C-alpha cells in the first residue's frame, strides 16, 4: 500500500516560502517514526527544503528534470517512483502539495498531524473527503517548552 503523511495547520495549510509556518520537534519525531526503514517519495520542491538525504529510509524525488545530487534516487513520473521503490509493504509519499495532489487517490491510508494554529500559507492539503476515510487512531498534545502549539496526530483508512 502507499500512504501520505502530512503536518496541517488551520485550513488544510502545509507551508509558504518553501518553508513550515511552524517548528515542532515531536512532530518530526512522529514522521521519522513512520517512515524510517520505508522508501519516501516527495518532489523537488520539498526535497529542497529537507536539504539532504534522509538516514534509513530510500528518498525518491520527482524533478522533470536530472537529478542534482547522487545520494537520492531520481524519477521523472509517478509510475517511476512507484516502480522505484519496487516490492515493500508501504510507501511513504511526503509531499508538497503537487505530489500529495497526484497521490492521494493512489493511498490508502493517512498519518495527519492537526497543529492548532492559524497561519497563512501557499500550499494547502488536497481535499480529502471524509466519507471515504476511518479514523483509527488519535493522540493529543499541548504546546510546550519546544513546541509552540498543540495538535493531534491522527490515522485514517480509506473505508
Ligand atoms: N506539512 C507537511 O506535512 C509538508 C510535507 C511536504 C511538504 N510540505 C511543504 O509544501 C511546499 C512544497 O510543496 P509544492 O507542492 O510546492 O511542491 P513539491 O511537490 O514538493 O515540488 C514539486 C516539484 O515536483 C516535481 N514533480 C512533481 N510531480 C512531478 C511529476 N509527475 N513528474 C515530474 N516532476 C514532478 C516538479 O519538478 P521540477 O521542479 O523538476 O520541474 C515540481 O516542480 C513547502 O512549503 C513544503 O515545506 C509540507
Ligand atoms: N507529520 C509530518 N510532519 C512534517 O513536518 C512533515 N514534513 C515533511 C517534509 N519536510 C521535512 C523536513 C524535515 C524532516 C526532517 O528533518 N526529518 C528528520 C527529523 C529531525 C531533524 O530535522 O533533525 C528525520 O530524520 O526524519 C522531514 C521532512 C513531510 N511529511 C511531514 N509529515
Given at each position: ?11 488544510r ?5 518553501n ?6 520537534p ?28 534522509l ?7 520527482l ?7 547522487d545520494?537520492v ?32 487517490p493512489?493511498?490508502?491510508?493517512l ?16 481535499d480529502?473527503?471524509?466519507?471515504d ?13 519546544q513546541?509552540s ?7 485514517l483508512?480509506?473505508?
Open positions: 500500500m502507499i500512504s501520505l503523511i502530512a503536518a496541517l495547520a488551520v485550513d495549510v502545509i507551508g509558504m516560502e518553508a513550515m509556518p511552524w517548528n515542532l515531536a512532530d518530526l519525531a512522529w514522521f521519522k517514526r513512520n517512515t524510517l526503514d520505508k522508501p519516501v517519495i516527495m518532489g523537488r520542491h520539498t526535497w529542497e527544503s529537507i536539504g539532504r538525504p538516514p534509513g529510509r530510500k528518498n525518491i524525488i524533478s522533470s528534470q536530472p537529478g542534482t545530487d545520494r534516487t531520481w524519477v521523472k513520473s509517478v509510475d517511476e517512483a512507484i516502480a522505484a521503490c519496487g516490492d515493500v509493504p508501504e510507501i511513504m509519499v511526503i509531499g508538497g502539495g503537487r505530489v500529495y495532489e497526484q497521490f492521494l493512489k493511498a490508502q491510508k498519518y495527519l498531524t492537526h497543529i492548532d494554529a492559524e497561519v497563512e500559507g501557499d500550499t494547502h492539503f488536497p480529502y473527503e471524509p466519507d476515510w476511518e479514523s483509527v487512531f488519535s493522540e493529543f498534545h499541548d504546546a510546550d517548552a513546541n502549539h498543540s495538535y493531534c496526530f491522527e490515522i483508512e480509506r473505508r
